[PDB]
């Protein structure tokens, strides 16, 4: 699993145990992401913070 970082020009290879790419958004997914990386489990959507996860190289 390669995941895109904040500028998706760049990517990192996920460490063992983390098989999701995520995008993190403030308030809305209709905005612009504020963080991009690897995670093990998509976090639940909070009232100010939102995530969309996928499981494919650079899908994020």
Author numbering: 1 to 60
Please share excerpts from the published article on this structure:
Cobra cytotoxins (CTs) belong to the three-fingered protein family and possess membrane activity. Three-finger toxins (TFTs) are disulfide-rich proteins from the venoms of cobras, kraits, coral, and some other snakes. Their fold features three distinct β-structural “fingers”, emerging from a globular core stapled by four conserved disulfide bridges. Cardiotoxins, or cytotoxins (CTs), are one of the largest groups of TFTs, affecting the integrity of lipid membranes, and/or influencing the activity of membrane proteins and the associated signaling cascades. For the first time, a spatial model of CT13Nn with both “water” and “membrane” conformations of the central loop (loop-2) were determined by X-ray crystallography.
Structures of hexagonal (with three molecules in the asymmetric unit denoted A, B, and C) and orthorhombic (with six molecules in an asymmetric unit denoted A, B, C, D, E, and F) crystal forms were solved at 2.3 and 2.6 Å-resolution, respectively. The electron density for molecules D, E, and F of the orthorhombic structure is considerably poorer than for three other molecules, which is also reflected in the higher B-factor. RMSD for Cα atoms of molecule A of the orthorhombic structure superimposed on the other five molecules ranges from 0.39 to 1.45 Å. Significant difference between E subunit of the orthorhombic structure and most other subunits could be explained by an unusual conformation of loop-2 in all subunits, except E. Previously, this was not observed in crystal structures of homologues. Comparison of subunit E with the NMR structure of CT2Nk (in aqueous solution) showed that the conformations of the loops were very similar. Unusual conformation of the loop-2 in all subunits of the hexagonal and most subunits of the orthorhombic form was similar to that found by NMR for cytotoxin 1 from N. oxiana (5NQ4) in DPC micelle. Superimposition of the models (except E) over residues 22–36 resulted in RMSD values in the range of 0.8 to 1.1 Å. Specifically, for model E the respective RMSD value was 1.8 Å. Superimposition of subunit E and A of CT13Nn demonstrated that the tip of the loop-2 was repulsed from the hydrophobic amino acid residues 8–9 of loop-1 of the neighboring subunit B due to crystal packing. For the first time, in this work the structure similar to the membrane-bound conformation of functionally important loop-2 of an S-type CT was observed in the two crystal forms.
